[PDB]
Amino acid sequence: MPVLLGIPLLLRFLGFLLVTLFGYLLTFLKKGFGKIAIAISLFLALIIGLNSILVG
Amino acid sequence: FVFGAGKPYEFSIDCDKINLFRGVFAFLLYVATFMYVFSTFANILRNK
């Protein structure tokens, strides 16, 4: 299906930006699931900590 | 403690029956602290 000389490269580029940008969203998602790991850890560590004082 | 130093009516509250009270009194203060430390750990997330 005949096309001009530059259209096939505009169509390949408009799906490079999309995969790059959808690649960044993934990186940031994974980071925010690491915050909920730090948070949980902290809480349970403060509980185990108080126990050791009171029983002493 | 001596009531009536020198007079015919001299008597003394002795220590043998007071030392027994201090024994029961110690116990009833430990029981009342164990039941406070305990119950404050259990309700640490129950906003008192």
**DSSP for A35-46?**
HHHHHHHHHHHH
Resolution value, angstrom units: 3.0
Give the minimum alpha-carbon distance from A32 to chain B in angstroms, rounded to a whole number: 26
CB B11 within 8 A of CB B4: yes
Question: Which residues does chain A have within 8 Å of residue B44's beta carbon, measured at their own beta carbons?
Answer: 47, 50
Residues on B contacting A at a C-beta cutoff of 8 Å: 37, 40-41, 44
Rounded alpha-carbon distances, angstroms, from residue B30 to A34, A35, A50, B23, B27: 45, 43, 20, 11, 5
The pair phi, psi for residue A9, each rounded to 5°, is -95, -20
- Contact at CB, A51 and B44, closer than 8 angstroms: no
What was the elucidation method?
A: cryo-EM
Interrupted after residues, chain B (C–N over 2.5 Å):
none
**Helix, strand or coil, per DSSP, at residue A17:** helix
Q: Is the dihedral of CA A20, A25, A28, A29 positive or negative?
A: negative
**DSSP for B3-46?**
ESTTSSS-EE--STTTHHHHHHHHHHHHHHHHHHHHHHHHTTTT
